[PDB]
Scaffold this active site. Structure first.
Site, PDB file in Angstrom:
ATOM      1  N   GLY A 290      50.979-141.163 -16.691  1.00 52.22           N
ATOM      2  CA  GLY A 290      52.279-141.340 -17.319  1.00 52.22           C
ATOM      3  C   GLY A 290      53.199-140.209 -16.914  1.00 52.22           C
TER       4      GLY A 290
ATOM      5  N   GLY B 205      53.587-140.070 -12.679  1.00 52.85           N
ATOM      6  CA  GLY B 205      54.585-141.025 -12.138  1.00 52.85           C
ATOM      7  C   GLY B 205      56.041-140.646 -12.443  1.00 52.85           C
TER       8      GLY B 205
ATOM      9  NE  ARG C  11      53.838-140.997  -7.964  1.00 58.04           N
ATOM     10  CZ  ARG C  11      52.881-141.110  -8.883  1.00 58.04           C
ATOM     11  NH1 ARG C  11      52.217-140.039  -9.332  1.00 58.04           N
ATOM     12  NH2 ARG C  11      52.605-142.309  -9.397  1.00 58.04           N
TER      13      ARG C  11
ATOM     14  CB  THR D 287      61.270-131.356 -26.970  1.00 62.97           C
ATOM     15  OG1 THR D 287      61.535-131.806 -28.306  1.00 62.97           O
ATOM     16  CG2 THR D 287      61.851-132.365 -26.021  1.00 62.97           C
TER      17      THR D 287
ATOM     18  CB  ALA E 169      61.944-125.495 -31.479  1.00 64.07           C
TER      19      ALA E 169
ATOM     20  CB  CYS F  74      47.459-116.406 -14.770  1.00 65.96           C
ATOM     21  SG  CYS F  74      46.946-117.593 -15.958  1.00 65.96           S
TER      22      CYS F  74
ATOM     23  CG  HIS G 186      51.679-116.154 -16.736  1.00 66.54           C
ATOM     24  ND1 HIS G 186      50.920-116.963 -17.567  1.00 66.54           N
ATOM     25  CD2 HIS G 186      51.387-116.516 -15.461  1.00 66.54           C
ATOM     26  CE1 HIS G 186      50.176-117.768 -16.820  1.00 66.54           C
ATOM     27  NE2 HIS G 186      50.432-117.507 -15.539  1.00 66.54           N
TER      28      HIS G 186
ATOM     29  CD  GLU H  67      54.168-114.183 -13.804  1.00 65.96           C
ATOM     30  OE1 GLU H  67      53.704-113.226 -14.495  1.00 65.96           O
ATOM     31  OE2 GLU H  67      53.484-115.165 -13.583  1.00 65.96           O
TER      32      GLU H  67
HETATM   33  N1  LIG Z   1      53.727-135.168 -28.676  1.00 69.29           N
HETATM   34  C1  LIG Z   1      54.221-133.944 -28.603  1.00 69.29           C
HETATM   35  N2  LIG Z   1      54.050-133.146 -27.535  1.00 69.29           N
HETATM   36  C2  LIG Z   1      54.634-131.909 -27.502  1.00 69.29           C
HETATM   37  N3  LIG Z   1      55.388-131.409 -28.498  1.00 69.29           N
HETATM   38  C3  LIG Z   1      55.583-132.158 -29.621  1.00 69.29           C
HETATM   39  C4  LIG Z   1      55.006-133.491 -29.731  1.00 69.29           C
HETATM   40  N4  LIG Z   1      55.333-134.040 -30.887  1.00 69.29           N
HETATM   41  C5  LIG Z   1      56.062-133.123 -31.499  1.00 69.29           C
HETATM   42  N5  LIG Z   1      56.222-132.004 -30.744  1.00 69.29           N
HETATM   43  C6  LIG Z   1      57.017-130.812 -31.116  1.00 69.29           C
HETATM   44  O1  LIG Z   1      56.621-130.368 -32.404  1.00 69.29           O
HETATM   45  C7  LIG Z   1      57.757-129.945 -33.143  1.00 69.29           C
HETATM   46  C8  LIG Z   1      57.901-130.725 -34.441  1.00 69.29           C
HETATM   47  O2  LIG Z   1      58.025-132.113 -34.156  1.00 69.29           O
HETATM   48  P1  LIG Z   1      58.737-133.146 -35.163  1.00 69.29           P
HETATM   49  O3  LIG Z   1      58.482-132.745 -36.591  1.00 69.29           O
HETATM   50  O4  LIG Z   1      58.323-134.490 -34.601  1.00 69.29           O
HETATM   51  O5  LIG Z   1      60.255-132.932 -34.694  1.00 69.29           O
HETATM   52  P2  LIG Z   1      61.547-133.411 -35.511  1.00 69.29           P
HETATM   53  O6  LIG Z   1      61.170-133.760 -36.941  1.00 69.29           O
HETATM   54  O7  LIG Z   1      62.466-132.182 -35.438  1.00 69.29           O
HETATM   55  O8  LIG Z   1      62.083-134.598 -34.759  1.00 69.29           O
HETATM   56  C9  LIG Z   1      58.953-130.069 -32.245  1.00 69.29           C
HETATM   57  O9  LIG Z   1      59.237-128.752 -31.706  1.00 69.29           O
HETATM   58  C10 LIG Z   1      58.521-131.086 -31.235  1.00 69.29           C
HETATM   59  O10 LIG Z   1      59.295-130.949 -30.029  1.00 69.29           O
END
Ligand SMILES: Nc1ncnc2c1ncn2[C@@H]1O[C@H](COP(=O)(O)OP(=O)(O)O)[C@@H](O)[C@H]1O
Ligand SMILES: [Mg+2]
Ligand SMILES: [Mg+2]
Ligand SMILES: [Mg+2]
Length: 1281
Positions: free
Chosen positions: A314, A317, A320, A389, A664, A1121, A1246, A1248
């Protein structure tokens, strides 16, 4: 015959805790197993013999991994290997190392696990149950002899093409081939093929039919999205695609490319694009616009069958797609999404969960969220893009929705992967394809993948990494970029991508089947042309650039083949030199000939939906349940598994503040290593709302994306660009009309009113699962599931706000964009009490939403905000709780003004959020919000306060009160349980229990030197810039930011690939400094850093070059690393390194990406001069960082020699082995060591990635541009003189 198999026993394969999970799994199914023991065993298929010396080399390559208790075999052998006819990625990468170590005799290396099981009762029936548990039926098979492994390497003869005898049987031959080959052709499409082939007067080949059926499927023609519609008896004026395009007709602003490529592009910022010049090898800043591409993809069905590769490809692809935008581009950062049914974690079932069963052929929701995130992260990590995110939703319930009472959920999951990249202005437009253009497959030798084994994918991210480096070398040539046109290979394999490539250029092509690279010689022409093997691209290149393109690929070790020529005649030809014939011979208009549009004649269903039954609902019980719904709950298990610091450009990752709490609301990257301009990403989604109200679910997705991005400095809302990914059960009663209405609601209405473009999107339109449970038919159907990803140019990365509360004098203000509607339908609250409820949230007032956005932008620019967190799942309750978790503080709030329905005030999921301001700013901020038409929605709530109290009052009544630590630990339990069952439970438990100790002060800093004194400046001022060799092997991914850090300190950073050294183009004799960079060289196969090191040791010329370098009296070397790993394995070449440890699998048994506290310790290290006693956080991102010594004598000797240079400390400031403060389990917190002379230093973290203050996840307010870690690079400069 023609080839010999050699068996070579490897090391023990499973840690004690893994053996105990096995033994216990067996005790739980009544299999009396006295004991179990596992050993890796390797299989070398040789084309010629090995001398005694090459034999020893091979043996030595195949010693790796943790030094676990070795045992002599006993009991019954069960050997688990890949399924015959299959080649694992391990094999690809290990064989590669074999070849780059000079072992050309090796045709293939493959690995299995030999299990030695003492049980001794056990009917043969029960041995099949034992066998079952030790392997994955979709990828592996079980054998009884090590000898049986010869079955893995059988040579097959190319299978011929098959004609379908239309001439000889009539139409029946097409019908028969439609069934035999699984072409899923409609009658009007069988008609077309009959007519076309009857006209040509010859039978179709199997390949020609299969190509046609791939090209005319739903997922590929997008029949639904182009359909005409009739809804409740009225023809509609617009298709869905047209309604999406309406957003670009209304708002073209900032858009550079939309709907003409496999990513969209918008305007970025003018900044220093940093890369090595083609002619000098020196890294330089190139001041030019870095424009921003964006794309989001799904990979839903595969993930249901085999989640690890399903999620991995997922991501792969979609990466790419990014790379193949325009005439080449560079992925930067990624996003990840999962929707699945109830987790039902054993021992941790929640009161809303009921087992409804599932199909035998798919895996459970829990399997998807165990193995899928690890798969997505494996590609992102081994490729090298940070995952910043994401979302993760659970939903599975029996519900009275549009079609009455039925089961809705995600048995077929959403697996979502997307991201942003950068691209040069001149490469945004795809070029013309000249006649006689060479047509190239760039990437991996193909196998029979994708043709339920055909839904089991396979990822080799390092192959893709090697390809990206080529793509990078090509765009970095500017006007001399040889790439005329480029496209990704995905669905349909070559049978789609080569015809699409020539066709977008107005050409045909003639191809040669036997030019295409293959690792199964048995494949039929149909299999070669239509297989969906991974890590491939198709490009066009002028014949006279081929020597250049060859030099570029060879230096990256990226395989490629010229497979055909572009023609003026718009014909498609495919020759087979082996069988001297022509599998494909067609005009392109025939292949790409279309049947008529689809018409959908459909009716609106709308659910009535009943009021929330509150009988068992208390505010207190609801708080507890809501924090245990995985949608709401802490996501650490999804975040720390992926690197978040790769590139050196990440400003805001998921983890916030000193206590590193993953809340965040959006991701932010810098545009360059020299700017504060940037990019932002956020997601909005609210699928369960669609069980009540389709339009409102889509509108809320748009709105949440916007609320999640709003505390970032963007400006004009028209800068914000959307991907819309639509997931539906098309045809399920009520959904089609639902889909049209929801597309209309965003495409025709909401997005145009706001000035928001949707220049990219995708759809997946059969989101349902049907199976037999009793004698009953059963169905699980997804809600209409729109996922909006928002992307934006950022004006100033530094001004981003987080949910982290300040405890300075402050005011908490709610912006309730729900306007007191306080809807409870399709909320987390309803879900967690097994209900749907009445009326869901929605966008109540479009002007006010716009007003909210612009107001947030004015407040951000003017620095009036201390914090921001939007309201989404779990309502204001969750918003405030999460802010209190991030600030490690209390809250004292009053909700009397939010209505008398306290449950609805706290738990509605209407749009908006809580801003925190300084107390003195409260009046001015309320006045500003009032200018944007918001006074009515804005509610002073109270204040953040030092302490552990979370209190919600209404007038004189306490509505809700609890310890903030108690809430924060409850909110953690989902990630705790997931980590417990996936990772080493000891680590999962230590991580979890440390959250309960409120005294934890969080990350904190002590500096032994002035982090602003640029001690290299007197040197930089002379204009004399010593070179540093920025050393990289295939799979290295951190070379660019390493270069940039040495550059800030006054070096000329030179790009040195190992191929430049092997080919004699660079000599280390010309350098005084060298750095081995981070990454996943060879995907860490045969041990992280081993392939890299051993390819140096086994080449005597290159070996001697490194040894000479290290034996000079003034040279400096740094390994970071992967580089530290490498140099620890080259230790025989390095003086004063005899006490050095090895670095092996983390005790957690998990990739750890943490912002970790370390202290600098006293050692000879010249790179750490002036820093001793400093304590500061650093970026850590590895799976094989655990320091391993050979015994306590080695450790004491290392320690007494004074060679340890960095240690992990907990936040109290003591050296620790507790997790994750020490993310890997290293004795005495060790993560860096030096040599006796201090001239060579190696470290796992890391520096850097975090030499810029903006790129530290948390940092003290008063720091300037430079982090403490910038001192290392400067110490290097000063030391050289
Ligand atoms: N499947 C995931 N993979 C990576 N990060 C994730 C995933 N699901 C949620 N997060 C991260 O975890 C945090 C909390 O998520 P969530 O409570 O779903 O966000 P929100 O309520 O602000 O929409 C956020 O910083 C989000 O980007
Ligand atoms: Mg949330
Ligand atoms: Mg949010
Ligand atoms: Mg969300």
């Amino acid at each position: 015959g023609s080839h010999m198999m050699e068996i070579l026993r490897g090391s023990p394969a499973l840690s004690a805790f893994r053996i105990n999970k096995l033994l216990a799994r067996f005790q739980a199914a009544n299999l009396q197993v006295h004991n179990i023991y596992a050993e890796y065993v390797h299989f070398a298929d040789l084309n010629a013999p090995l001398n005694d010396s090459e034999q020893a080399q091979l043996t030595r390559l195949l010693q790796y991994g943790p030094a676990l208790s070795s045992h002599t075999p006993a009991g019954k052998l069960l050997l688990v290997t890949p399924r015959p006819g299959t080649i694992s990625p391990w094999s690809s990468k290990a064989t590669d190392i074999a070849h780059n170590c000079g072992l050309q005799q090796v045709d293939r290396l493959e690995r299995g696990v030999a299990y030695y099981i003492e049980a001794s009762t056990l009917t043969a029936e029960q041995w099949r149950q034992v066998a079952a548990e030790l392997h994955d039926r979709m990828m592996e098979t079980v054998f009884s002899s090590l000898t049986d492994a010869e079955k893995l390497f059988i040579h097959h003869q190319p299978a011929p093409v098959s004609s379908v005898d239309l001439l000889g049987e009539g139409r029946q031959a097409l019908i028969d081939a439609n069934l035999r080959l699984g072409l899923a052709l409609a009658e009007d499409e069988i008609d077309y093929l009959q007519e076309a082939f009857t006209k040509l007067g010859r039978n179709p080949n199997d390949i020609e039919l299969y190509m046609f059926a791939q090209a005319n499927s739903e997922h590929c023609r997008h029949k639904i999205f182009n359909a005409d519609w009739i809804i409740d008896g009225k023809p509609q004026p617009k298709s869905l695609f047209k309604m999406i395009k309406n957003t670009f007709e209304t708002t073209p602003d900032y858009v550079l490319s939309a709907y003409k490529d496999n990513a969209a592009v918008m305007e970025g910022s003018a900044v220093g694009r940093y890369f090595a010049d083609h002619n000098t090898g020196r890294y330089d800043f190139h001041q030019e616009p870095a424009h921003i591409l964006m794309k989001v993809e799904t990979h839903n069905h595969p993930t249901a069958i085999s989640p690890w590769p399903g999620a991995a490809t997922g991501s792969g692809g979609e990466i790419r797609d990014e790379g193949a935008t325009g005439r080449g581009a560079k992925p930067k950062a990624g996003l990840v999404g999962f929707s699945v049914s109830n987790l039902r974690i054993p021992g941790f079932e929640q009161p809303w969960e009921e087992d409804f069963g599932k199909p035998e052929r798919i895996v459970t929701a829990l399997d998807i969220m165990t193995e899928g995130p690890l798969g997505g992260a494996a590609f992102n990590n081994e490729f090298g893009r940070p995952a910043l995110t994401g979302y993760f939703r659970t939903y599975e319930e029996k519900v009275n929705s549009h079609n009455g009472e039925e089961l809705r959920g995600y048995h077929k999951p959403i697996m979502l992967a997307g991201g942003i990249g950068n691209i040069r202005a001149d490469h945004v437009q795809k070029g013309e394809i000249v006649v006689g253009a060479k047509l190239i497959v760039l990437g991996g030798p193909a196998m029979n993948i994708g043709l339920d084994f055909a839904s089991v994918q396979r990822d080799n991210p390092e192959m893709e990494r090697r390809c990206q480096e080529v793509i990078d070398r090509c765009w970095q040539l500017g006007d001399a970029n040889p790439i005329l046109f480029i496209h990704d290979v995905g669905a349909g394999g070559l049978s789609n991508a080569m015809p699409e490539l020539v066709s977008d250029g107005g050409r045909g092509g003639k191809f040669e089947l036997r030019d295409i690279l293959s690792d199964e010689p048995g494949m039929s022409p149909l299999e070669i042309w239509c297989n969906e093997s991974q890590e491939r691209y198709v490009l066009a290149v002028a014949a006279d650039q081929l020597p250049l393109f060859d030099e570029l690929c060879k230096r990256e070790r990226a395989p490629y083949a010229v497979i055909g020529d572009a023609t003026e005649e718009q014909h498609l030809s495919l020759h087979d030199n082996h069988f001297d014939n022509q599998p494909i011979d067609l005009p392109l208009d025939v292949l790409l000939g279309k049947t008529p549009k689809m018409t959908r004649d459909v009716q609106t269903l709308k659910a009535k939906g009943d009021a929330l039954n509150r009988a068992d609902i208390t505010i207190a019980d609801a708080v507890k349940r809501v924090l245990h719904l995985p949608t709401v709950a802490e996501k650490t298990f999804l975040v720390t598994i992926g690197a978040r610091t790769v590139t050196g450009m990440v400003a805001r990752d998921q983890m916030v503040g000193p206590w590193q709490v993953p809340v965040a609301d959006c991701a932010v990257t810098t545009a360059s290593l020299d700017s504060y301009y940037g990019e932002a990403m956020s997601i909005g989604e609210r699928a369960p709302v669609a069980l009540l109200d389709f339009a409102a679910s889509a509108r809320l997705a748009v709105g949440e994306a916007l609320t999640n991005i709003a505390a970032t400095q963007i400006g004009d809302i028209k800068r914000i660009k959307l991907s819309a990914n639509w997931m539906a059960a098309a045809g399920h009663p009520g959904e089609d009309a639902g889909l049209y209405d929801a597309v209309k609601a965003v495409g025709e209405e909401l997005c145009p009113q706001l000035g928001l473009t949707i220049p990219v999107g995708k759809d997946s339109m059969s989101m349902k699962t049907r199976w037999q449970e009793g004698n009953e038919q059963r169905e699980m159907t997804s809600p209409l599931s729109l996922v909006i990803s928002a992307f934006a140019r950022v004006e100033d990365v530094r001004h981003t706000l987080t949910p982290q509360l300040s405890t300075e004098d402050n005011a908490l203000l709610l912006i309730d964009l729900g306007k007191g509607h306080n809807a409870l339908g399709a909320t987390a609250l309803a879900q967690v009490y097994r209900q749907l409820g009445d009326k869901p949230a929605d966008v109540r007032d479009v002007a006010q939403l716009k007003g909210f956005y612009d107001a947030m932008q004015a407040l951000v620019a003017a620095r009036k905000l201390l914090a921001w967190h939007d309201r989404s799942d779990g309502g204001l309750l969750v918003t405030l709780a999460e802010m209190a978790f991030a600030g490690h503080c209390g809250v004292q709030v009053d909700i009397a003004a939010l209505g008398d329905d306290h449950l609805a005030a706290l738990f509605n999921e209407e749009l908006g959020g809580v801003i925190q301001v300084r107390a003195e700013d409260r009046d001015a901020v309320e006045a500003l919000l009032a200018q944007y038409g918001l006074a009515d929605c804005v509610h002073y709530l109270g204040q953040a306060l030092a302490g552990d109290r979370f209190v919600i009052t209404a007038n004189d009544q306490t509505v809700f009160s609890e310890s903030r630590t108690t809430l924060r630990v409850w909110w953690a339990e989902t990630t705790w349980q997931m980590q417990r069952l996936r990772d080493n439970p000891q680590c999962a438990d230590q991580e979890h229990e440390a959250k309960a100790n409120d005294t934890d002060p969080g990350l904190n800093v002590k500096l032994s030197f002035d982090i602003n004194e640029d001690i290299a400046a007197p040197y930089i001022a002379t204009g004399a810039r010593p070179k540093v060799a920025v050393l990289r092997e295939q799979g290295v991914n951190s070379h660019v930011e390493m270069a940039a850090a040495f550059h800030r300190a006054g070096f000329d950073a030179i790009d040195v690939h190992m191929s430049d050294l092997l080919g004699g183009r660079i000599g280390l004799g010309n350098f005084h400094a060298l750095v081995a960079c981070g990454g996943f060289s060879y995907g860490d196969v045969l041990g992280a850093g081993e392939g890299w090191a051993k390819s140096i040791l086994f080449n005597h010329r290159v070996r001697d070059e490194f040894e000479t370098f290290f034996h000079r009296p003034q040279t400096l070397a740094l390994g970071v690393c992967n580089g530290c790993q490498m140099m620890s394995n080259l230790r025989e070449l390095i003086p004063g390194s005899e006490l050095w440890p090895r670095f092996v699998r983390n005790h957690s048994d998990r990739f750890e990406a943490r912002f970790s506290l370390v202290e600098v310790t006293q050692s000879p290290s010249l790179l750490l001069q002036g820093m001793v006693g400093s304590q500061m956080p650093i970026a850590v991102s590895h799976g094989e960082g655990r320091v391993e010594v050979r015994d306590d004598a080695h450790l004491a000797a290392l320690e007494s020699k004074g060679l340890v240079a960095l240690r992990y400390v907990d936040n109290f400031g003591k050296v620790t082995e507790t997790y994750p403060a020490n993310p890997n389990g290293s004795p005495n917190g060790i993560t860096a060591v030096t040599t006796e002379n201090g001239r060579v230093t190696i470290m796992m973290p890391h520096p850097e990635r975090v030499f810029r203050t903006v790129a530290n996840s948390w940092h003290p307010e008063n720091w300037g541009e430079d982090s403490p870690w910038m001192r290392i690079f400067r110490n290097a400069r000063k030391q050289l003189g």
